[PDB]
Design a protein around this nucleic acid. Structure first.
Lengths: 169, 72
RNA sequence: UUUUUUUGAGCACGUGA
């Protein structure tokens, strides 16, 4: 709906110049800012890019989302309305069944809220899950509801006690 | 004692977050981030005189100006 | 503790070298 984008999984060494250029191909840009540590300046690995027109905003997603830049696949998504309601929405989920898949998380966590990002950690040398994941909901209460609803329970398939905390840091 | 080697310069240009300094006792035009500036930035502008230490940025080996303050 | 880093002091001249 709006003209503001969030860009995720930027390589560390990406800079405002470089990001701007890449996205300026889609259309004219009001603002473009890579988030970093004020005192050291290291990149938080994400950025906001606000296009002039809703056209270009939308097109950028269509085109740029998923493109590879120095072994990182960018994620160009719509920036949601930020504030206090977005805080504390990242859950460190553990003790899942080893056989867990992606659709299985949509089932387990879908009804408690709309999910932003999720990752099933795998031991890449095996390629098969460690039985650990991340799930980031949109709004705070979606996360909080899912915590109480799922912490210490057995999944709808496996037979082990889930652990659903807020993610540290 | 004597350890912190400070020198002087003039504000050459400002952006919203960083600026550039013409060094007086050094032929160089250094970058500096507002992290390195002390107090009231809101009223600092081109031409203000400043004292600072030339270091190189620990992250990015670039020549920079650290611990910047004004004397005006 | 993820493609370390998804809601905000442009950390290289404000901008497709």
């Amino acid at each position: 709906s709006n003209t503001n984008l969030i860009v995720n999984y930027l390589p560390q060494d990406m800079t405002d110049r470089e990001l701007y250029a890449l996205f300026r191909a889609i259309g004219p840009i009001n603002t473009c800012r890579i988030m970093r540590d004020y005192k050291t300046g290291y990149s938080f690995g994400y950025a906001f890019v606000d296009f002039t027109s809703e056209m270009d905003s939308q097109r950028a997603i269509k085109v740029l989302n998923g493109i590879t830049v120095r072994n990182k696949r960018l994620k160009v998504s719509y920036a949601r309305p930020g504030g206090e309601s977005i805080k504390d929405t990242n859950l460190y989920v553990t003790n899942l069944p080893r056989t867990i898949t992606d659709d299985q998380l949509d089932t387990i966590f879908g009804k408690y809220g709309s999910i932003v990002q999720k990752n099933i950690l795998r031991d890449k040398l095996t390629g098969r899950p460690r039985g650990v994941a991340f799930v980031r909901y949109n709004k705070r209460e979606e996360a909080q509801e899912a915590i109480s609803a799922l912490n210490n329970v057995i999944p709808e398939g496996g037979s082990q006690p889930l652990s659903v905390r807020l993610a540290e840091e | 004692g004597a350890m912190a080697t400070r020198e002087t310069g003039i504000i050459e240009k400002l952006l919203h977050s960083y600026g550039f300094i013409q060094c007086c006792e050094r032929q160089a035009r250094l970058f500096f981030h507002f992290s390195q500036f002390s107090g009231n930035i809101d009223h600092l502008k081109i031409g203000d005189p400043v004292e600072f230490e030339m270091t190189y940025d620990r992250r990015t080996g670039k020549p920079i100006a650290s611990q910047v303050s004004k004397i005006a």
